[model samples]
Target chain A: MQQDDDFQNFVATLESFKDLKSGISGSRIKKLTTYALDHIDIESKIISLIIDYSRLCPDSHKLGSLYIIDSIGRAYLDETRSNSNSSSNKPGTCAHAINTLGEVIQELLSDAIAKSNQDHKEKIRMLLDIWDRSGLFQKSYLNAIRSKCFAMDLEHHHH
Target chain B: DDDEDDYTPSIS
Candidate 1:
C-alpha cells in the first residue's frame, strides 16, 4: 500500500489539480498513452485492459490504488455538480492519478474504431456498459446527466 | 455559430 499512498506533500506544480475537477486534459492524455497510441499492438483481438487487474492482486498497495482512483472520481463528479462543496478536504495526489485510467482506456478503444469494422461499435458499447457498472464509475451518476429528471427536480425544488 | 443575424433553421 505504501507504493503510491506516499503523498508526502503537494508541491506548487501539482496543486492546481484541485480545480482540475474538469475532464482530462491533452497533456495528461498524451502522457497516459505515451501519445504513441499508434504503436499499440493492433493485431491482437484483446488490447491492454485498463481494469487494474493489479488492484485485484489481493495485494494491499494495489487495493489502495483502487481507492485512490475512486476518490479522484468523486472529485471529478463533484466538479460538475451545481452546488459545489467546500474545498477543505480537497484531493491531493489521488484524483490526478485517477484521471488517467479510464481516459486512456477509452481513448485507446476509440482509436481502435478505424482499425475495426462492425466489432468496434460493440466493443465500445461494452466498455461503456462495463464502466457504468464498475465501482469507480457508476451508472446512476451518468443517468442523472442523461435525463431531464434531475433538471426537473431542481426546477421544482428551486421554484 | 451563424454569421447571419436572424438565421434560424429552415423547415420548408
Candidate 2:
C-alpha cells in the first residue's frame, strides 16, 4: 500500500514538476530519482511511467525526465557489477533489471525523438553520448540505443 | 534559458 502510494506520488510529482514555461523542478526531480533508486523492485513500472509521461510532457521537460532515468540506470549498473563480482557466475536481480530496462529505454528514446523538438533531440543524443562515456551499460546495449536514435534520424530525414 | 538540471545529485 505504501509502495502504491509512492508510485502515485511519483507520477503526481513528475506531472507537477514539469512546466512549459518554468521547466523542471530540481527538488522534485531529486525526490523522484531518490525514490526510484530506493524502489528498484518496481523499476520496470517506473520506466514505463516515465515513458508515458514523456509522451505527454513538453519537449522542454523531456531532458530532465531523462536525468532521472540516467540516475536510476546508473544505480542498476552499479548493482549489476557488484552482483557479478560476488556471485561469480549467475546473473543477479540488477543484471536482469538492467537488460529489461535497457530494452524498454531504447524504445522510449526512439519514441521520444520521433516527436521531439530539435533541441530535445540534440539533448537526447548528448545523453546517449554521456552514457557512452559513463560506461553504465554494455557497449552493445549502448549501441542498440544509439541505433534506435540512428533509425529515427533516418526516418525523419528521408522526408 | 534551459532549466533542465544536468547536475545529478551525487550518491552520498
Candidate 3:
C-alpha cells in the first residue's frame, strides 16, 4: 500500500493539537484527566492521544516524560478510587488496557530516542493486539492513533 | 544500519 497516500489522510483525521510550548499546564492536564474520567470511551481516547504524543518524531512536549507519567497515573488512581461503579467492571479487561497502553508508552520512548541517534542498538518493540491489530479494538484505541501515524501507517514510509 | 538488521518495520 502507498504509505504516503495513507498518512496524508491520517494527518487530516487529527482534530486536536497540543502545542505544549509553555511547558506543563496543570489546568489543561487536569482538563484532559477529568475528561478521560468522564466516560470509559473518552478515557480510552485520551490514551490514544497520549500514544500519539509519545510517538511524535520530535516528541514535542517538554514537561519530561516522567512527570507526565506521574501526573497521568495520579489522576487515573484518583478517579478510579473515587468512582463507585468501576468496581463492577472486569479487572482482567481493565488490566489488559493498562498493560497495552503502558507498553505503547515504553515502546515509543525507545523508538523516539533510537531514531535520534540513528541508534540501532535497540530491541525495538510493539504492543501487539493493541494499537495496530484489526482484532478486538475498542473506541479509545481507535481514536488514539487517529490523530497521527500509527505503526501500520508507517509501513510505506519505512526505508 | 541495514543488514537484515535487528529490527524490521512492525505492525499488527
Candidate 4:
C-alpha cells in the first residue's frame, strides 16, 4: 500500500480500537493482537501511535499496549495473592500475562518500523521480518507458560 | 565577527 494510505489506515484502525469504550480486558487484548496481525501492513504505525499516545496522554487516558500490559500484570498479581490466601489455582491467568508481554514487544517492534525515516525504511523492513519470527517464538513461550499454569490447576483440583 | 555584530532583535 502507498505510505499515505497506510497512514490513513493506521489512523482508522487506531480510532476503531480507541472507540472500544469499555476498559481493557483479556478478550479485548486478544482481539487487538488478532486484528493487528491480520493487517500487518500498518502494524508498525499503529504501535507507534500507541506508544506515543501513551506518553502524551494523561495516565487515565492511556490505553493500547501499555494499559494492556499494566492490566495483565495487575490481574496476575491479584491471582497470585488470592492463591496464597485460598490455596486454589487459577488457569489461563499466566497465559494472559505472558501473552500481553509478547504483545507489548510486538508493538515495540512495530513502533520502531513505523517511525523509521524514508532512508531507513528498507532496513526497518528487514528488522521487522526478523521480529515477525521472534513473535512466533513469543507465542510459543506464552503457550508453554499457559499449559504449565493449566497443568498446575488440574493437579491441584485432582489432589 | 562583523556579520555577527550586525544581527539585532527587533521588537514588534
Q: Pick the candidate with the highest TM-score.
A: 2
Model 3, A59-90: lDDT tens digits are: 32312222333344444544555665236454
The worst-scoring run of ten residues by lDDT in candidate 1 chain A lies at: A39-48
Clashing pairs in 3: A48-A144
**Order of candidate numbers by lDDT, starting with the best:** 2, 4, 3, 1
User: How many residue pairs clash in all the candidates, one count each?
Assistant: 1, 0, 1, 0
Candidate 1 C-alpha lDDT tens digits along B1-12: 111111111111
| lDDT assessment of candidate 4 | 0.38
Provide TM-scores for the models: 0.24, 0.63, 0.43, 0.30
DockQ of each: 0.01, 0.21, 0.03, 0.01
Interface RMSD of each: 17.0, 5.2, 15.6, 27.1
Model 4 segments more than 4 A misplaced: A1-9, A13-32, A63-65, A68-159, B1-12
Models, CA RMSD each: 19.6, 5.7, 14.8, 21.8
Model 1 bad stretches (over 4 Å) = A1-96, A102-106, A135-159, B1-12
**Residue by residue across A73-95, what tens digits does model 1's lDDT show?**
33334442323322322332223
**How many backbone overlaps does candidate 3 show?**
1
Best by lDDT: 2
Candidate 2 per-residue lDDT over residues A6-98, each given as its tens digit: 678787777675643434566677677677656565665666666676556665666666666666666656655555432433233455555
How is the predicted docking of candidate 2 categorized under the CAPRI scheme? incorrect
Clashing pairs in 1: A1-A61
Model 3 misplaced stretches (Cα beyond 4 Å)? A1-17, A60-69, A90-96, A111-159, B1-12
